[PDB]
Design a protein around this ligand. Structure first.
Ligand code: GDP
Length: 194
């Protein structure tokens, strides 16, 4: 079972599908313009982990928008068994990123031991000063008294076309999805009889 279980903290307009279509990418005259909504779904995406076996690990993340539509049930999907992704753009990185605190705390309430990584999508939405304005605020409020740890990492991406920033996104995923284990867990990709 070479699959990682995950959940997203973000909302419509951040750009998660924008990133994904250039990760979990297809052919010509298929993928197009992006939109957003709220409901419950999930997406399966391979991670290029090893130089001799790149195709061996896959992410499976639950997709929903950070609205009361999911938030009211969100506390019941919480577990150390899930890894978390956070997706905001580079304007939101300063202005709205903050929106996930009530979600992060539901995660915390069960386990804050599992990592969360924040990606700043739509890098080009903001200028260098604003991008730094986001970064320089986010990375200062990360750790606290009540048990919420600092984010494990962060990355900024231009997501609408083929992109090296997505390659960097992937590199980040490769490391965290490889380095993180829940106790000395059997690697999920092992002979585990369901
Ligand atoms: N052109 C452009 N659109 C973006 C970008 N990032 C975010 N958006 C928009 O944000 C929306 C995607 O929202 P999403 O994060 O996937 O929310 P979800 O429906 O809850 O998963 C789409 O309308 C995208 O066009 C970007 O890189 N540039």
């Amino acid at each position: 079972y070479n699959r990682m279980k995950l959940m997203i903290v973000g909302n419509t307009g951040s750009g998660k599908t924008t990133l994904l279509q250039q990760l979990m990418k297809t052919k010509k005259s298929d993928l197009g313009m992006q939109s957003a909504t709220v409901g419950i779904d999930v997406k399966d995406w391979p991670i290029q982990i090893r130089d001799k076996r790149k195709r061996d690990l896959v992410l499976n993340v639950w997709d929903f928008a950070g609205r009361e539509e999911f938030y009211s049930t969100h506390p019941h999907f919480m577990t150390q068994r899930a890894l978390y992704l956070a997706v905001y753009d580079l304007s939101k990185g300063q202005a709205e990123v903050d929106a996930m605190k009530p979600w992060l705390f539901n995660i915390k309430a069960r386990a804050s031991s599992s990592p969360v990584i924040l990606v700043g999508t739509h890098l080009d939405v903001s200028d260098e000063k604003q991008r730094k304005a986001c970064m320089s605020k986010i990375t200062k409020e990360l750790l606290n008294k009540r048990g919420f740890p600092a984010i494990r990492d962060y990355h900024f991406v231009n997501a609408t076309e083929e992109s090296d920033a997505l390659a960097k996104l992937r590199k980040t995923i490769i490391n965290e999805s490889l380095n993180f284990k829940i106790r000395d867990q059997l690697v999920v990709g092992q002979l585990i009889p369901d």
